[PDB]
Amino acid sequence: NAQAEEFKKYLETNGIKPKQFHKKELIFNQWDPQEYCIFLYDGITKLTSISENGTIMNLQYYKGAFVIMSGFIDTETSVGYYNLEVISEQATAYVIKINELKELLSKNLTHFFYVFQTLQKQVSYSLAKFNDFSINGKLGSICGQLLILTYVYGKETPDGIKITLDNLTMQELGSSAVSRIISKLKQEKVIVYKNSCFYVQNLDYLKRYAPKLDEWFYLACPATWGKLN
Amino acid sequence: NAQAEEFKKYLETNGIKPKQFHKKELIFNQWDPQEYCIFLYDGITKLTSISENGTIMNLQYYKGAFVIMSGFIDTETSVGYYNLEVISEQATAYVIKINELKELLSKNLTHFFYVFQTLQKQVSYSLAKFNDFSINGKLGSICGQLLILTYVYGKETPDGIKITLDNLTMQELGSSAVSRIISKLKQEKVIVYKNSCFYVQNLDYLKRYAPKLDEWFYLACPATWGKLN
Numbered sequence: 239n240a241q242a243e244e245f246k247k248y249l250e251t252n253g254i255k256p257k258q259f260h261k262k263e264l265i266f267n268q269w270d271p272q273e274y275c276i277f278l279y280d281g282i283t284k285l286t287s288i289s290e291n292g293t294i295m296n297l298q299y300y301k302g303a304f305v306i307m308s309g310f311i312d313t314e315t316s317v318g319y320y321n322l323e324v325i326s327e328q329a330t331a332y333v334i335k336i337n338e339l340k341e342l343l344s345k346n347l348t349h350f351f352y353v354f355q356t357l358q359k360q361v362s363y364s365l366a367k368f369n370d371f372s373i374n375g376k377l378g379s380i381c382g383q384l385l386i387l388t389y390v391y392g393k394e395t396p397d398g399i400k401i402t403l404d405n406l407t408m409q410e411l412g413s414s415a416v417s418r419i420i421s422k423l424k425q426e427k428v429i430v431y432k433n434s435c436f437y438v439q440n441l442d443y444l445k446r447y448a449p450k451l452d453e454w455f456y457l458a459c460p461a462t463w464g465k466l467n
Numbered sequence: 468n469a470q471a472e473e474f475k476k477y478l479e480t481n482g483i484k485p486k487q488f489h490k491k492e493l494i495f496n497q498w499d500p501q502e503y504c505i506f507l508y509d510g511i512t513k514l515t516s517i518s519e520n521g522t523i524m525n526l527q528y529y530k531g532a533f534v535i536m537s538g539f540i541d542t543e544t545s546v547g548y549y550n551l552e553v554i555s556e557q558a559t560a561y562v563i564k565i566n567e568l569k570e571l572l573s574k575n576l577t578h579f580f581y582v583f584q585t586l587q588k589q590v591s592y593s594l595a596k597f598n599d600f601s602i603n604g605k606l607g608s609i610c611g612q613l614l615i616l617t618y619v620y621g622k623e624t625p626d627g628i629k630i631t632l633d634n635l636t637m638q639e640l641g642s643s644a645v646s647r648i649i650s651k652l653k654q655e656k657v658i659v660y661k662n663s664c665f666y667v668q669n670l671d672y673l674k675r676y677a678p679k680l681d682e683w684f685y686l687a688c689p690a691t692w693g694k695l696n
């Protein structure tokens with residue numbers, strides 16, 4: 239990822255320091271009155287929300303390299319009250335106060351375009367995710383998440399496509415319908431737990447029920463989309 | 468909105484003329500290889516997708532003033548295959564090719580920050596609606612749709628809070644489960660349909676089953692929010 243490495247070197251040049259985090263750590267949480275811009279350089283995270291009675295809802299997953307913002311770039315108001323939690327064993331992130339960001343981007347348009355693009359990818363990603371929900375219900379959503387996991391962590395092997403993630407991360411990613419659906423897929427040999435990993439066979443089935451996410455990845459990450467097609 | 472008028476002027480300074488469109492026109496369509504930046508200024512539109520078997524998925528609805536983009540500003544490549552379709556009677560929209568946009572934003576960052584912040588509102592908007600549907604099901608959706616109508620088109624009346632839309636537009640966007648929900652909201656007199664118009668008289672019930680959208684209106688459109696609170 240060329241833009242990402244360039245954005246790292248730009249942040250470090252401007253004196254911004256990389257912070258290590260550990261699983262279950264919160265890079266920011268939903269009560270913080272400091273709005274941040276997080277450049278997640280390495281790791282896997284989830285955006286969660288905590289409702290008033292304390293039940294946790296998982297909203298979105300992110301992966302390095304990527305930008306996540308808790309405030310609006312001009313106002314430096316919260317965009318929404320959320321937590322960003324680390325779910326891989328480690329993660330590396332550059333934490334930037336919102337207003338510092340405005341300055342950093344103002345003085346370099348290339349980086350500004352890059353950050354802007356990361357927003358565009360979230361917007362196109364949620365359109366595609368809503369599309370596949372609209373057609374195939376939860377089946378759209380499970381397949382969609384399995385498909386991206388495969389494109390991003392799948393190693394072609396005679397065994398199929400191995401999803402290269404130690405199990406703890408897979409458990410952090412994953413009800414009635416679910417069990418019955420995840421059932422159906424195992425039953426149908428789309429995925430297999432063999433040799434202690436998931437291995438994916440019917441990539442075509444994933445693509446069928448999550449078509450828009452297939453397209454979205456093709457446009458967003460073409461080089462990666464090519465390696466399994 | 469202030470930022471909205473000023474970007475309209477900047478666009479006309481740089482020679483972008485408003486193009487008028489009428490109900491059911493495609494502002495752009497998915498096969499068009501030209502990536503665009505649509506600044507919807509007035510009217511209502513919807514983004515749609517066309518799955519292969521030909522069914523038209525409604526993905527999102529938009530209201531002037533707002534920004535819709537069909538290419539990534541950095542690589543200038545397609546963000547997806549979409550159609551942008553008018554559903555109001557007429558709408559005012561400035562259509563800018565993606566390369567010309569990038570130049571316009573590059574020479575005035577104020578406007579760059581406005582467009583950037585517009586996509587940020589779009590990101591958290593869809594997370595908020597998703598939080599509400601995951602927590603409260605269709606009651607969360609329905610209560611979200613009506614909350615939306617209320618803030619944007621809610622004109623306070625003795626009869627309560629009227630929804631100021633020609634009732635063919637209403638009728639353009641609007642099942643078994645749905646009717647059980649509206650059946651109840653009509654019975655408990657949270658909404659009243661009289662004189663062929665919707666009215667709202669318990670704003671606080673809606674805020675209960677859609678607390679993330681309510682919270683989103685507050686952080687992203689405080690002016691609108693505060694008017695009704």
Ligand SMILES: O=C(O)[C@@H]1CSc2c(C3CC3)c(Cc3cccc4ccccc34)cc(=O)n21
Nearest residue numbers: 282299300301304359360363383386387390458
């Ligand atoms: O990392 C990237 O540049 C690409 C392009 S934008 C994106 C996303 C979208 C949230 C913005 C995701 C999210 C995602 C989807 C499905 C499974 C995931 C598993 C782990 C982490 C994130 C996941 C993933 C992703 O790779 N990308």
Ligand SMILES: O=C(O)[C@@H]1CSc2c(C3CC3)c(Cc3cccc4ccccc34)cc(=O)n21
Nearest residue numbers: 364367368371525526527528593596597600608
């Ligand atoms: O609001 C819009 O103009 C579109 C059309 S109705 C909708 C929703 C639904 C709650 C009513 C959402 C939220 C949402 C629900 C279910 C699955 C989702 C999957 C991904 C993202 C959001 C999801 C978002 C949204 O944009 N819209």
